[PDB]
Every structure is written in structure tokens, then in C-alpha cells.
Design a protein that fits this description.
Chain B: GO terms for molecular function: hexosaminidase activity. Two copies of one chain form a homodimer. Chain A is α/β, with parallel strands linked by helices and about 625 residues long. Helix content of chain A is about 45%, strand content about 10%. The first copy, chain A, is globular and about 85 Å long.
Chain lengths: ~625, ~625
């Protein structure tokens, strides 16, 4: 517990204070460190015998340097470190639009960890989850950030010389906002999650978005602007007939950019809309517009360098103002995929380097409810930072353990509910953590994707492994406690529905009674404990808003487990001659991975995991 | 009761209807005659009864029984205005009417004077080689549909399947396999021009041709996104109407192949009531089908007449589709159904309409009981046969054992006292129920001063009717429990807020420890009653969605409890949920002297968060 005795020369007050905060994370030994800015390297550290000289190029890179220093002094007296970062900016973007809105205090902790890793930039992805004046439905009951909360988060990042970029939506993905049945909202709509191009009240809204953002210091923004298939085909088509869609996209983009210009923003956007550059009057419009933005090539999936290169080459044929968006996999349920994230980071990094890409944005999406922990992907983030600054992973685990207290190997065990043994490591989205959990009991529609001889022992062993890590994870224990309880549930739940069917089919009524009176009530108890663990996780990381969806989904699961109990009981009492749910033969849930030598699949929509019945449709 | 002139078929039909009706000790001579739809004459124990159509005997018997309780001398002649009067039950919104219930419903329709029974089936019938079609939905086997049609045939009632040949196939197309995804344009719409789609449609008519009936409703409504999805990516921009014509033509040829005559909604032919190559294609096909003009909403005959005349121009082989309101949650709206039927009947007569179809939709989960609308069914029978409602209540009591006004108390969870009778879809039964506790986004539409008494009085009334309801008691018990819940749940959210704002910590404690645990107990009871109601009328499939929705609401009440407890223990400065000011849920009824509204999607009642979106 002894406080650090470290001594520094050449720091500003801002820097000394920043360092005091980071002593909460890293353990600085009793040495003397001379610090100066220098253009010579991103980071240089030299010295021995308690006397060290530390240079950084950019103010924020001091914080990574210190992580490096602590790490190297653990095993060595003499230090010979020089790092040259491949990327002028390295960013992490947190999804705050899928129900999980990262709370102010967790944003500050993430900024501290990102400063230790080497990121220059912090980003938050907000569709409807920022307050806009005069638009009371925009973010309503969503925990939308106030301008003050956004300023506060930015300002904290500024304490570490880290920049903030809001990622917003200026055309589509505004579904939580446009659902509201008041004229002031409905008149802004084209169809689904898409706003109505050409409508002045739409640009009044978009102006409002920028008015809010211009209260920040930052003048950089991601405006989204991906190509939605339905754009121009809803109430737009009804009012204005058929137009050229890329011409429509251009028309809208130009309006957005002019508004951005008025408030002094530079805009980044997904490159999709310009894929055709890689009808001449439209080609010209597009070409003029691509010159006013930074294009972002996003890819979270490819298992080799050359697949990325092919794309980068195509892009450079039209723009040098290019950033790459990789992915920290945390959008497939309760459990991340840091392993897959590693695999693809390695290849993407090579390609970014070959194509001298200047900027990398690591994305943390939270698809379909935000149920994966915000801090579950710290390893993926350290990975990218290592790849940037060192171009290898030789120091990954040690730097990670300096920063978090856990080896990267232990932390990455967080992924276990997805790591079924027969999966090859290079296919994405295979998410048993989720679909085993929310699957019905009586009507187990994912049951053909289960392999209980392998899955049962995997999940059970994962629960023990995660319990052990939890005990040494300190302030990250909550992450592993949640995952240990999930895996424990999955070890039984993975085949309970099949075991019911087997018992029903062979008329083993003793087994059905055991299942209905012991196993299922205990399964409910386990899921209620998990719900409590989950809520503790959520409330620590996020605002309360959005947790309500999870309460709804897990409440329903519990109620369906009770239904299995009651239905079995009726049948045991000889009231029912048959249980009709059990007379339905189970088909494959999807053929997406039908060709492969494993039964697992991808299933990432709660409402289709839970029931074959209608639930959202009229 | 002694009869003469009946077939064996007819004497057995009557033995079945003796289960619903109490024939007196009299002699009745029965014969067919074109003189009247129904005629009854006689006195002092001997009567002569005649029917035009065999099925009209069963209504005649309901009339016979009724009048003889009043008087000795009977003088009845009825001229049915409609050549066919049909009831269509929705079997696609999760609730699939079980066979035993189809049989009870058939029996009752026969007593009422209906000629035709229809089941609305999107994906809820089995198709050979199409295992995802109705998978885990309780889709009828061919055996089941034949059994149902065969039971109707016993009462000389015909059967008409109502299916979908273009759109409204959401529960089928969602399945993520090539053999289903290859059939999709977009959303709930099939891909026009795709042979594998015509192979599916052929299978639909393959299944249906196992029936005796050769009359079908094929749907063919005009969905906005038709030709705009994967059709557009494959074939580029094309005329919407032409597209529909090409599909309709393919569908009709498949029908012709199986010997079926098709009805369909008239919507695609509104424009022709256009490019010339298109007005030709249209005009042809208009003559090959019966058109169905659907309207469940209008409160004046002239509004219906306007539409009828427009329709009469185009190609007047036209049927009308009215509405027995049972698609707005847990609770029907027979009252509103009567208001519109009265005017719809006038419009149908004024325009010489041959056939009326009463539709019983189940929007967004089928949570309203199948037998909840018997009053509206009788209303249409009485309006077809007598053109008035003087005999409504008495014929209804004969058929069911309850007066029509007693039965119609089933509507009470929707009948808030400040509502005008002619605005539709106002459904506090459902949204007061499913609303969150901490985040009550429909709260500006509650009026605890009138609503709390209304619902509370309703639970008593309905408890009283339950006790004299016989085989329909389950309906009223369900609704009694619902109303009892609503009388406190209508403002528990607001009372939590007021207490919170006023630092009334003892109240919040009673709410969190007493009221809300009791509320959950009541909701669990309701769930049980509902589940009994459901499993009595429907197949088990589709119940699971209700389990889910109700499971979620109970977990959300446990959240209100726990959040309040954390606050009471000092471990929170504020309850952030309660710091959000509640806006109007919708402005649909903003300009009115009442606070209630329409909100009929579960997922948007229950949470402002995302729940189905990615």
C-alpha cells in the first residue's frame, strides 16, 4: 500500500495532476525521471540505476510512457525504449445508443485507461442519446447526455490531452426517436429509422444537433451518413416520386456539411456512399462532396491483410483523407470476443501500415440492447495500442497487467461463453452466450446448434476458471463474477430442453418430474442471481435507463421457465394426453453456418431467440 | 319437443344445438320454401316452420324458442338482406382457434343466422415441403381444417379460408434459411416474379384443395413497400400496379388450376375506380375475382355509400367486410361495433350488397378472447334478418343464457365515462396494463379521479355477471381481475412520483412493500385466468408471447420495488427515472375533452428503450 516515492522533473502542473490520478491504476517505483517533449520519437525511455530520461512527442503519450516505465523496471534496471506509433490518431468509440449509456464516472475511468494504453481520442456513439434544445422526444427516457455531461466528459479527457469526437447520425439509425407518435416527430420521417431528405424541419433538427455539439471544444464529428437501402423509398417516394438515390444522398450530405461548416466542424463519415466512385452528373456531385470529409473504411471481420489492402487501394483511388474503423467485439450478447478481436487486429494493422493509414478508430458496438459489459474489451484496446506503438504483441500482457492488475490471458477468459472448442478461431458472431441463455425451454428453437457432450463441460469449467480470476481481479471482479454465473447457467440450460424431449419421448416420468420440480426452479434461482449480477454490472457502468429492456427480457424468460414447469406438471397429472410443444420436430434455426463442421451458429436478435411467435409485429 | 319433416342430418344438428338452447314441449312441422328466409306460424302447441336455405332452420329455432316465452301465437317472417353472412376469426396473431372451439363457434353462428365460417391464416396452415411455414405457430393440419369444415357442413355452413398470397407473412419470412429468404422482397412481402414463390403459392392451394370449399380470400392488399426491396435490387424500378397485376395473374392461374374462385381486398383497384397498358391488365383481372371493401370505422351511412358507389363503378361483384372489435388488447369493443354496424347495414342495403363478412382481428398478440364478441355477431345477424335490434337481447339470451347488455359489460375496461361512443381504438384496458411503473410513459392519459372508480366498479359488475354466465363465466372472470388491477395500477406510477417529490418516505415504503407486491400477486392471478381462457379457446402456441410480456411487466414491478428500497436506505441521491417529466405518449387525440388514447403495440407501451431494433 505504500504511496509512490517517484520523482519527476520537467512536468507541467497539468501533467503532475494527471499522474496523481493514474497512480490509482499503476504502481510507480521510487526513481527519478527527467521528462521533456521531443519530436525524436513517439515515446523514448533511457537510463539506469534510478535515473531515467523520458521523452514523448504528443502530450498524451506521457501516460503510455509511464505504463511502459513501470513495466520495464519490474524486471530490469536499465531501459532502452523507443516507440514510433504508426497512427497519428488512435480512438476508442463507445456505443451509447443501444440502451447502455456509459455513465459519467465510468467514462472518466475509461479515459484513464485509454490514456495509459496510448489512445489520443475518445468517442461516444449517440443516435438519439444527446439532448437537443426544443426536441423533447429526442432521447426521452433514454438517459440522453446533457450538454453539461458531454462537456464534463470532454473536459476530463482534456486533463489527459485526449480529444473527444461525438459520433452521431444525420440520416438513419434514429429509430428510438422516430417511433414517437407526435406530428413534430412523424413529419421528419421517410420510413423506418430514416429521416425525410428535403424536409426543412429535418434540417432544423440537424442544425439543433450541431448547436448542441458546438458547446463542446472539439470541432471534429462523425456524422454517420451510411447508405440505407430504404432511403428515398418511403414518405419521400410518396411526395416526390422516384429519384436517383445516390443523387438524393448527395443532396442531403451537402445540406449537412453546410450546417457543419456554419458551426466550424470537420466531418468524418462511413465511406459506403462513395463505393460507386471506386451517371456522370452524379459522379461529379459525389466527387465534390468526398473532398469535404474524412471517409471511414469500416471492417470488423476479415481474417487476412490482403482483404483489407484490396479495399484500402480502392479507397486511395478516390481519397487520401481516410480513416479505418476496426472492432472491439462487444455487440453479441452478454459476452465479448476479445480473441476474435485480436485475430483481426493483427491483419488490419498490417494493412493500415502498408497503406499508410493515419487514423484508426476501434469500435465498441452494443447491438440489440447493450448487454455486454463496457469494460469487457480492455484487452482488445491494449492490443490495438501495442500494434500501433510497437507493431507487435511482445509487451501486451505485461503492459496490460501494469494497467489493470490482470494478465491479458486471464482477462481474455471473459470471452469463454463464446469459446466453444470446435469453432475455428476466425469466424465472427458465433454467440452461444446469448442464444443458449434466452432460448425457450418448451420450444427450444436453437436446439440443433447445441452439442452438449462438448458444451456442457466447457461452460462448467468456464464457471470455475472465471470464479478464480474474479478473486484476483480487484476492481474488475464484477466482470468475471457475471460471466462465471452465466457459464454456470449455460452448462445445464444448454440441453435441458432436449433432455425434457427425451424423457417425454421415452416416457421417463421420473426424469420429467425431477426436471420440473428441481432443475427448473433452480435454473430460475440461478437466472435471478445472474440478473442481480448483471444489474450490478450495468448500474456500475451505465445510466439506469435501458436496463428496463433487460428486466423485461429476463422476466419473460423466467415466466417461460415457469410455463415449462406447469405444463410438465399438468401432463404428469394425466390431465394432458400430450404436450403439443414437444410434438414439434426442431429445425435448424439458421443455415448461415450450415456448411461448417460445428453445430454452433449466430443468433443476435432477442425477439427471435425467445419465440417463434409474433411479438413486435401487428 | 316433437318435429316433422326433418332429415336425419337435421335431427342430429338439433340434438347438438339442444346444448345451447331449450326447445319447449311443442310440435313443429318443418319444410323448405322460397317464400321467406324464415317463416314461423302457429299457435297452441303446433307450428309450421319454413326456411329458404337449410342453415336458416337453426336461426329459426332460436326465434321459435324466444317468442314462445312471450306469447302463444307466433307470426314471424324474415327476409335476410344478405345472400351470405360470414364470421372470420383471426388465427394468425398468435391465437389459433382450437378445433373444439371452432365447433362451439360454428354451433353458435348457426343459431344466429350466419351461412359461412372463415379462419384467417397467414402462415397458420401446413404446406407439404414447407416446414418453416407455421413452424412452432400451431398451424392447422389438413386433417384439422377438414374436420372443422366437416363440422360446419353438419349445419349447412360453408367454410372459406382466408390466406395471404403476397404480404402479411412476417412470421414465415423471418426464418433465416435460403429456402425462405429466397422468397422475400422485403419486410412481410414475398418476391413477385420469383418461381420459388409461385411454387410456395401452389403448395397453399394444394393444401386448400383438400377441402370441399372452392371459395377463398387471397388477400392481395397493396403493401407500400411492394417491389421496393430485393425486387428493386434485382429488376430496377417498375410500375407498382403492373407489378401487382403480374402477381395477381399468377395467383389466379394457380387458383384456376385447383378450381378455386378468389376474393381479395379491393385496395389495388382503388386507382381504377394510370398508364394504358396498366388499365387494360387491371380491367381484365377485376372481373376474375370478388372484391371486398373493408371498413370498421365509419359512423354514418353516407361515408360508406361514397365508397360503395366508387366501387360499383369499377366492377360491382363486391362484398363488404365489417368489424367485430376484438383487436385492441385484452378487452373487446362490442359497444363501438354496434354503433358502426347499425350504419354499415344501411349502407350495404342502400347499395344492394349481396355478402357481408364480419372480421374478428387479433392485432399484436391475440390477447382478446375469441368468444368476447358474440354480441357483435348477433347484432349483424339481427340487422341482416330483421333490419332492427328489437329482438337482439332476447335472441342473444336464448343463444347464450345472458342478456346482450349483461354480456356487453365485457367491454368495460375500455368504456371510460368521458369518451364519446364513436371514436375507435381507445384502449386503456391494454396500455394501463402493460405500462411501466417507474417510467409511466402513458401517464398523461390517465384520469385517476374518474378511472379509479370506473375500473373498481367494473370489477364488481363483472364479478356479478360471471356468477350467472354459465359456460361463458371464464370471459367475465378474466375481465373482472383485469379491471381490479387497473383501478390501482392506473396511477400507482403517479402516486410514486408525488410521494417522491414530497419526500413522503412512509408512503413510498408502503407502495414498495405493500401495494406493488400485491399488484404482482394480482397480475399473477390475471395471468392464470388469462392462460385458462387462452388454452380453452386456442392452441397452446402463441401463449408464450403473453408469458414473455407478462413476465417482463412483473420483473419491472420488482424493479420499482428495489429501486425505491435503495433510495429509502440512503444509497441514492435521486431516482433518475422519476426525475424525467412525462410528455404525451401520442397526439392522436390531443384536441379532445378526454385524456385517454390509442396505443396498441406492446413493445412501445412497455418501454421507451429499444427492444426489437439492432
Amino acid at each position: 500500500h505504500m504511496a509512490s516515492m517517484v520523482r519527476f522533473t520537467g512536468l507541467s502542473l497539468k501533467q503532475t495532476q494527471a499522474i496523481e490520478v493514474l497512480k490509482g491504476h499503476i504502481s510507480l517505483p521510487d526513481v527519478e525521471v527527467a521528462v521533456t517533449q521531443s519530436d525524436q520519437a513517439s515515446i523514448s525511455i533511457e537510463g539506469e540505476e534510478g535515473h531515467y530520461q523520458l521523452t514523448y512527442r504528443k502530450p498524451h503519450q506521457l501516460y503510455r510512457a509511464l505504463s511502459l516505465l513501470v513495466t520495464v523496471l519490474a524486471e530490469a534496471d536499465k531501459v532502452e525504449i523507443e516507440e514510433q506509433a504508426a497512427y497519428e490518431d488512435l480512438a476508442y468509440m463507445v456505443d451509447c445508443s443501444r440502451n447502455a449509456v456509459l455513465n459519467v464516472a465510468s467514462a472518466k475511468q475509461m479515459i484513464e485507461i485509454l490514456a495509459l494504453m496510448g489512445y489520443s481520442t475518445f468517442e461516444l456513439y449517440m443516435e438519439d442519446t444527446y439532448q437537443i434544445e426544443g426536441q423533447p422526444y429526442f432521447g426521452y427516457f433514454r438517459g440522453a447526455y446533457s450538454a453539461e455531461e458531454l462537456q464534463e466528459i470532454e473536459a476530463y479527457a482534456q486533463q489527459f490531452d485526449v480529444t473527444f469526437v461525438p459520433c452521431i447520425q444525420t440520416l438513419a439509425h434514429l429509430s428510438a426517436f422516430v417511433k414517437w407518435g407526435v406530428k413534430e416527430v412523424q413529419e421528419l420521417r421517410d420510413v423506418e429509422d430514416i429521416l425525410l431528405i428535403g424536409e426543412e424541419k429535418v434540417y432544423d433538427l440537424i442544425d439543433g444537433m450541431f448547436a448542441t455539439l458546438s458547446k463542446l471544444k472539439t470541432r471534429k464529428v462523425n456524422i454517420g451518413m451510411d447508405e440505407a437501402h430504404l432511403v428515398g423509398l418511403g414518405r419521400y417516394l410518396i411526395l416526390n416520386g422516384v429519384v436517383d438515390r445516390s443523387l438524393l444522398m448527395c443532396q442531403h450530405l451537402e445540406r449537412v456539411l453546410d450546417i457543419a461548416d456554419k458551426y466550424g466542424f470537420h466531418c468524418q463519415m462511413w465511406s459506403d456512399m462513395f463505393f460507386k466512385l471506386m451517371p456522370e452528373e452524379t459522379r461529379v456531385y459525389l466527387d465534390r462532396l468526398k473532398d469535404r470529409v474524412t471517409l471511414v473504411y469500416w471492417d470488423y471481420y476479415q481474417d487476412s491483410e490482403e482483404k483489407y489492402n484490396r479495399n484500402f487501394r480502392n479507397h486511395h483511388k478516390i481519397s487520401h483523407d481516410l480513416a479505418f474503423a476496426g472492432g472491439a467485439w462487444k455487440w453479441i450478447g452478454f459476452t465479448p470476443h476479445n480473441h476474435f478481436s485480436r485475430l483481426v487486429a493483427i491483419e488490419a494493422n498490417k494493412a493500415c501500415r502498408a497503406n499508410q493509414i493515419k487514423e484508426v478508430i476501434v469500435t465498441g458496438w452494443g447491438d440489440n440492447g447493450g448487454e455486454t459489459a463496457q469494460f469487457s474489451i480492455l484487452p482488445s484496446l491494449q492490443i490495438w495500442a501495442e500494434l500501433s506503438y510497437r507493431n507487435d504483441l511482445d509487451g501486451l500482457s505485461a503492459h496490460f497487467k501494469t494497467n489493470t492488475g490482470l494478465t491479458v490471458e486471464d482477462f481474455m477468459q471473459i470471452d469463454l461463453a463464446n469459446l466453444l472448442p470446435d469453432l475455428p478461431g476466425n469466424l465472427s458472431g458465433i454467440n452461444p452466450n446469448r442464444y443458449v441463455f434466452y432460448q425457450d425451454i418448451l420450444c427450444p428453437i436453437l436446439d440443433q446448434h447445441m452439442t452438449p457432450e462438448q458444451d456442457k463441460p466447457h461452460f462448467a469449467q468456464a464457471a470455475e476458471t472465471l470464479a478464480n480470476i474474479k478473486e484476483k481481479a480487484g476492481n474488475y471482479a464484477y466482470l468475471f463474477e457475471t460471466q462465471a454465473q452465466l457459464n454456470a447457467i449455460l452448462s445445464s440450460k444448454v440441453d435441458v430442453g432436449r433432455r425434457i424431449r427425451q424423457a417425454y419421448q421415452a416416457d421417463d416420468k421420473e426424469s420429467l418430474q425431477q426436471i420440473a420440480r428441481q432443475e427448473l426452479p433452480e435454473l430460475r434461482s440461478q437466472i435471478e442471481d445472474f440478473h442481480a449480477l448483471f444489474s450490478h454490472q450495468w448500474l456500475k457502468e451505465n445510466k439506469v435507463f435501458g436496463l428496463d429492456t433487460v428486466d423485461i427480457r429476463m422476466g419473460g424468460l423466467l415466466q417461460r421457465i415457469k410455463r415449462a414447469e406447469s405444463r410438465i406438471e399438468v401432463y404428469l397429472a394425466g390431465q394432458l394426453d400430450r404436450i403439443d410443444e414437444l410434438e414439434v420436430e426442431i429445425l435448424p434455426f439458421t443455415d448461415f453456418y450450415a456448411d461448417k463442421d460445428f453445430a454452433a451458429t449466430t443468433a443476435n436478435q432477442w425477439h427471435t431467440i425467445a419465440t417463434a411467435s409474433t411479438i413486435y409485429t401487428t
